Write a protein that binds this ligand. Structure first.
Ligand code: HEM
Ligand SMILES: CC1(C)[C@@H]2CC[C@@]1(C)C(=O)C2
Length: 405
């Protein structure tokens, strides 16, 4: 389902990429996207898929577009248009300077200090989950760890029932990797139906949870509205539940296939942070965009006010102009250059929490289960979308090779 080429689009700039169903997906998700950086591909193309839109392909252009909020607005950040249109999360669908008051609050909730307060639980949860796993000599890493680990820490933070996971997870998944089971607007509603009562109650009877704090905060002198709180909260949920979950699956899948990498981390633990940065770069997974506010000639191409443009955050670090031998995992690159957590005024506030969770997992897994691999005959499937994922990650290990701690 290709849309008719709009008039302003030079036919030599056409490249029919389907962000929801790229071609050599069998080859891995990052690889599937990297066709975009083949020499036959112009730096800025128009795809007729998903209703027609621009995609920037080069770290250079992505960052530039990301910095440029005057021309490239966050109002409608998702493709397809119906979704960017329905999209109303705060701070994400706002541009500076308005964005700034809301970010400041959200930061109150997710930033450094919060991570520092939660570290012991993060550590406790990981060790517990791994240890519980260890003696079985096999899991479903996606279901067995990658989901519970990040989600439960989130639910704790948020003050929500663990019993709510499956529902929320489903709704979260519909937004980033649409099934076709529900439209974006429907999904957003259902999450909103969830959130409202909860907000209501936290305004009256505040607690110490993230939800309570958002519901009762101040923005540019006055009190947040219930609608604004609904709108930030809905973001925190999506932010918290999807990305870390999938990221661990990519990284875990790579580690399961690279003994030499696992060993490096075991012997030279001082390298974890650097490795973490390296995996963030190679296993980058987020792809969203911006809307043209006006007619704009950007790097010789004429964009029309109203045109959407995908600026894949995933793409910067995979770009050979940015990183030599991009597809190669190297824990000792002089410079890990990426925009995994974005760029510009919208850079991830959850970055600190994300990293803490990555590092703990690496350290804690490698400790108890140093040697593991992908199950004989499992075909690992990747899914593409706003956040790309891994469907299932069947692992096998010999328990006699494990160490209880
Ligand atoms: C590996 C993990 C993650 C990755 C790769 C990631 C990626 C991103 C990206 C690319 C953006 C910028 C979006 C834009 O410019 O349109 C962003 C923003 C944001 N993410 Fe993260 N995310 C991750 C985890 C988290 C976590 C754990 C949280 C906290 C619950 C979270 C909360 C946020 C928030 C609040 C924003 C928006 C901030 C603003 O608009 O100023 N994210 N994320
Ligand atoms: C692109 C994102 C990863 C960022 C946090 C959750 C997400 C889906 C958004 O709506 C903004």
């Amino acid at each position: 389902n290709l849309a008719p080429l709009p008039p302003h689009v030079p036919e030599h700039l056409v490249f029919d990429f389907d962000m929801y169903n790229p071609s050599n997906l069998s080859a891995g998700v990052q690889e599937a996207w990297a066709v975009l950086q083949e020499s036959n591909v112009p730096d800025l193309v128009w795809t007729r898929c998903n209703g027609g839109h621009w995609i920037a392909t080069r770290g250079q252009l992505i960052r530039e577009a990301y910095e440029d909020y005057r021309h490239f607005s966050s109002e409608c950040p998702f493709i397809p248009r119906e979704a960017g249109e329905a999209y109303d999360f705060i701070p994400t669908s706002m541009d500076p300077p308005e964005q700034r008051q809301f970010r400041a609050l959200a930061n109150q909730v997710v930033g450094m200090p919060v991570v520092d307060k939660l570290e012991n639980r993060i550590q406790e949860l990981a060790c517990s989950l791994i240890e519980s796993l260890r003696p079985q000599g096999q899991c479903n890493f996606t279901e067995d760890y990658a989901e519970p680990f990040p989600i439960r820490i989130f639910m704790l933070l948020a003050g929500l029932p663990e019993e709510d996971i499956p529902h929320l997870k489903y709704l979260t998944d519909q937004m980033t990797r649409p099934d076709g089971s529900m439209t974006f607007a429907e999904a957003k509603e259902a999450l909103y139906d969830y959130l409202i009562p909860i907000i209501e109650q936290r305004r009256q009877k505040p607690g110490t949870d993230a939800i309570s704090i958002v519901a009762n905060g101040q923005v540019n002198g006055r009190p947040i509205t219930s609608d604004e709180a609904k709108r930030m909260c809905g973001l925190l949920l999506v932010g918290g539940l999807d990305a870390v979950v999938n990221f661990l699956s990519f990284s875990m899948e790579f580690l399961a296939k690279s003994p030499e990498h696992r060993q490096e981390l075991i012997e030279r633990p001082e390298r974890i942070p650097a490795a973490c940065e390296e995996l963030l770069r190679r296993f980058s997974l987020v792809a969203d965009g911006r809307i043209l506010t006006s007619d704009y000639e950007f790097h010789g191409v004429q964009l029309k006010k109203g045109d959407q443009i995908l600026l894949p955050q995933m793409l910067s670090g995979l770009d050979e102009r940015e990183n030599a031998c991009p597809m190669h995992v190297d824990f000792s690159r002089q410079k890990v250059s990426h925009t995994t957590f974005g760029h510009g005024s919208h850079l991830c506030l959850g970055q600190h929490l994300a990293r803490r969770e990555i590092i703990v997992t690496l350290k804690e897994w490698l400790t108890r289960i140093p040697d593991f691999s992908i199950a004989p005959g499992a075909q690992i499937q990747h899914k593409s979308g706003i956040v790309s994922g891994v469907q299932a990650l069947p692992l096998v290990w010999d328990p006699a090779t494990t160490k209880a701690v």
